[model samples]
Target: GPMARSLIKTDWSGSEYTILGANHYEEPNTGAAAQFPGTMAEDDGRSPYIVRKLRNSSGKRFYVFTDHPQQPIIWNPHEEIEIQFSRKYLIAVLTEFEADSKVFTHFARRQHR
Candidate 1:
């Protein structure tokens, strides 16, 4: 049987996130391109984000902390959070078609190849 060619839908928008080095460098589950909705990429190892407990801010008297060079992320909204993944998502319809592949192929060595 030939592969099924499905057209993508274009009526939805969602969060755009990239996996950290913990997931990408270890598992090798990376891919060619995105299908729709979100974009994907990998980090070096330590992901950059905002500060949490200042020690001096929330639980501190807790000690002084990072000036938070990486400033954006706020304290976790709540004790609990819901995170969903986009691995091999199930497509329900081809309502319309819009291709979104945020990927590329680059050469590491440039020996004038």
Candidate 2:
């Protein structure tokens, strides 16, 4: 069977958010991209507009703080809170018809050719 395509969606500024194909990286600075009519990352009480407290299979906990709203993500949470807080999320996305394979392949890289 062919690969099942999916899309990432989450909450930002207490509003519904869906990931987009547009992605980027920087030399050292870490931030997020928001929709037009704003600039830089959004913060509430010194925290980001969106943040992720994820624990991987290796028993490692990490924080994914977003300063830009346009940053692409690749996961889905089991539960969601209306405010800023970390929640449980699995390495999955909502099944969508449009296959954004470019982002997937780039992230799925290997050393040996």
Candidate 3:
């Protein structure tokens, strides 16, 4: 189930993202402001990830990651974030806020061929 913190606003504009830093195996075809569920898959067996700091009009820093082609994940503003790069995809996001900042995380492993 999609949690509250994972609920990204679809109407956010490019100005909403500060983009402190970003690095991936290859450049993303879609723009940064594009909504989630965007494809980052160009070649199989390639691990790609992006790290950036975004700030809304409220000046809150939202640390985010775009990884795992199928099971994408993100950490809302002021959230505790962590990631483990193994043979499988393991991501965890923890937050302290009450309303939309609840702590939530999920994990998904690659299917065997």
Candidate 4:
């Protein structure tokens, strides 16, 4: 039998990401180096994407990169980036799930502290 929807839907796991810095394999040679190049070739040493290292307000860290199918989203450090909305339409499909609970609480916790 197929798995339940709760396990499938509520299983979607992600956290708030703060874009830390863009990838530049090495130091720039110009006035200001282009950190995040929107498009990178697969043969271009770093694969198809130039990644952006990110951290969560709570202490987690990770990297985000785009492929040929994604649109360019230029971001800077110290700003929160919502991955879902950036990649998908922000239509209020529904407001029920543990995922929603965490999202709501994550902001509330940040506001009070």
Q: Pick the candidate with the highest TM-score.
A: 3
lDDT of 4: 0.27
The candidate, 2 or 3, that scores higher on lDDT is 3
**Best prediction by lDDT:** 3
> Positional deviation of 12 in candidate 2, in angstroms?
1.3
Ranked by TM-score, the better of candidates 2 and 4 is 4
TM-score of each: 0.14, 0.17, 0.21, 0.18
Full-model lDDT for every candidate: 0.20, 0.26, 0.28, 0.27
List, residue by residue over 15-99, the lDDT tens digit for candidate 4. Answer: 3332221222222232333322232112334343333332222222233323223333433343344333212111111122212
Model 1 — which ten-residue stretch has the worst lDDT? 103-112
Rank order by TM-score, top first? Answer: 3, 4, 2, 1
Sort the candidates on lDDT, descending order.
Answer: 3, 4, 2, 1
Query: For candidate 1, what is the total of clashing residue pairs?
Result: 1
The TM-score measured for candidate 3 stands at 0.21
Q: In candidate 4, how many Å is residue 38 off?
A: 24
Per-candidate total of colliding backbone pairs: 1, 5, 0, 0
- lDDT score at residue 71, model 4, on the 0-100 scale: 35
